[PDB]
Amino acid sequence: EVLFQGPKEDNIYNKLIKDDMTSGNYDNAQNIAKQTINKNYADDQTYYLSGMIMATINSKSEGMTEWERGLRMFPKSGLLNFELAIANRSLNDDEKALKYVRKALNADPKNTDYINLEKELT
Amino acid sequence: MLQGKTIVLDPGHGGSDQGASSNTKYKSLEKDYTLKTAKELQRTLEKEGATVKMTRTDDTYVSLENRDIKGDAYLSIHNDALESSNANGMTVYWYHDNQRALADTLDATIQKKGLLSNRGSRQENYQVLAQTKVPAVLLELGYISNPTDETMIKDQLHRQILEQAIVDGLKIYFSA
Numbered sequence: 541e542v543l544f545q546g547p548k549e550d551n552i553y554n555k556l557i558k559d560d561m562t563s564g565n566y567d568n569a570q571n572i573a574k575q576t577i578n579k580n581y582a583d584d585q586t587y588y589l590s591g592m593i594m595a596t597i598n599s600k601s602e603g604m605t606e607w608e609r610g611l612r613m614f615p616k617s618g619l620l621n622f623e624l625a626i627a628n629r630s631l632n633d634d635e636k637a638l639k640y641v642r643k644a645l646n647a648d649p650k651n652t653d654y655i656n657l658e659k660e661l662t
Numbered sequence: 663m664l665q666g667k668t669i670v671l672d673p674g675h676g677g678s679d680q681g682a683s684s685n686t687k688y689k690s691l692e693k694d695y696t697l698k699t700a701k702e703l704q705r706t707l708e709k710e711g712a713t714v715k716m717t718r719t720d721d722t723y724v725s726l727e728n729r730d731i732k733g734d735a736y737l738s739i740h741n742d743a744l745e746s747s748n749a750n751g752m753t754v755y756w757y758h759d760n761q762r763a764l765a766d767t768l769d770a771t772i773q774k775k776g777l778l779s780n781r782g783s784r785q786e787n788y789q790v791l792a793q794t795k796v797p798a799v800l801l802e803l804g805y806i807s808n809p810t811d812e813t814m815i816k817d818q819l820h821r822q823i824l825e826q827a828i829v830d831g832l833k834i835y836f837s838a
């Protein structure tokens with residue numbers, strides 16, 4: 541019905557993780573994300589959020605590790621590939637960053653944010 | 663200790679002064695995102711036990727002269743435009759001698775966590791820095807002219823990484 545014209549619904553786990561993150565309860569966010577990944581209930585947004593948490597309370601390096609782990613499970617994730625393109629740009633590894641964004645463009649060749657960053661990095 | 667200190671937050675621009683704006687379909691206005699950033703940082707700083715003064719608390723015009731509020735540290739928050747859309751990242755600006763340690767301390771902790779390219783700690787004469795004796799810095803937290811920075815400026819979860827890294831730096835800055 542009308543729900544394909546609308547945005548993709550977050551699953552319950554991702555919504556709980558996000559709600560703890562935006563209320564600044566990153567401890568409880570991390571625990572919910574950890575349990576979701578360990579039960580194999582995680583999708584690519586769960587790994588994304590998990591590494592965002594780690595970038596917030598641990599380090600960017602640990603966040604990037606978590607996103608790369610998510611890509612092993614979700615190799616075509618535009619979310620995780622874009623995020624790692626951004627991260628590698630911030631480390632001035634623009635050749636690696638350009639690999640990542642081209643993978644994200646494979647998933648979503650009309651996405652204007654992916655297009656813009658690939659244009660930037662070309 | 664950061665706890666008990668007064669931090670001034672200066673969200674750049676406001677009111678009739680939109681600040682910079684992106685050229686993308688988002689048409690983002692700098693004034694909107696500096697204020698979101700400052701209000702988020704205000705909450706996180708108060709949770710840490712700091713007193714926070716805002717140079718503005720809504721979408722209102724404030725002259726550079728009327729942004730001279732006293733505290734133990736002062737953070738001006740900007741999302742300016744550069745003429746090359748490919749230019750991107752984060753800069754921390756200081757001007758008087760007593761502002762350098764604050765900019766050097768924040769540049770280090772922000773680099774550890776934020777997803778912005780590090781353009782470093784730089785000495786530059788901004789009036790909000792030059793007019794005050796308070797340790798003050800001007801933060802460019804991504805350039806709104808850069809499409810990919812703009813995607814992160816527009817994103818609360820990315821902003822909150824930056825905001826935590828600022829808190830991390832303030833705790834080191836106030837370690838005595």
Ligand SMILES: [Zn+2]
Binds near residue numbers: 675681741742
């Ligand atoms: Zn500005």
